[PDB]
């Protein structure tokens, strides 16, 4: 039951949303009585996590959009955590990048923020 690596690869909320939708549809297409009665925590966690993701703006996303966003942010020398947070949150306001996003000092430059907003809104 040992784990090989707990930090193998960070993934955004879109992959989790797609996985939850696929698992939900495969479950509703292959619903089993005894398998469900054995453990009902699976259905609960899946449904509640899917609902939480639906409450977020994580919808209207596609792998092509994620790849375009990554290629756009690769020119800004930002770290993986910053772009991950920007993709998961999808900031529409600048103040979210100004104060909430860490490593603000010497990174905003007061000119790159407009480009970041234009990229995240596209």
């Amino acid at each position: 039951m040992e784990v090989k690596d707990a930090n193998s690869a960070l993934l955004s909320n879109y992959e989790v949303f797609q996985l939850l939708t696929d698992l939900k549809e495969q479950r509703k297409e292959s619903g089993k009585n005894k398998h469900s009665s054995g453990q009902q925590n699976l259905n609960t966690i899946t449904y509640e996590t899917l609902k939480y993701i639906s409450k977020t703006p994580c919808r209207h996303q596609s792998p092509e959009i994620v790849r375009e966003f990554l290629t756009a942010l690769k020119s800004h020398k930002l770290t993986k955590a910053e772009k991950l947070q920007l993709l998961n949150h999808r900031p529409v306001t600048a103040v979210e990048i100004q104060l909430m996003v860490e490593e603000s000092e010497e990174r905003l430059t007061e000119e790159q923020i407009e480009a970041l907003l234009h990229t995240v809104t596209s």
Partner: protein
Amino acid sequence: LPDVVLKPPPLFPDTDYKPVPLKTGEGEEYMLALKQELRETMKRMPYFIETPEERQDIERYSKRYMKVYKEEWIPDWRRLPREMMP
């Protein structure tokens, strides 16, 4: 005949003899202070090799600011055999 005991003997039996108090003087205090100074100064010595930290969570811009820097002594490879070169 010896009597029976209901409870086991105490884990730390008492003794009527106590340890002699330590020697006093400027010499003992100076040696104590010097031993404390050696304890404090030998851990920061490059000979004190610490356990190499591993499994970094992420890379960050603050890495260069928090990067631990310490001078490393160069062993004399003439006296040391060849098998210990990096």
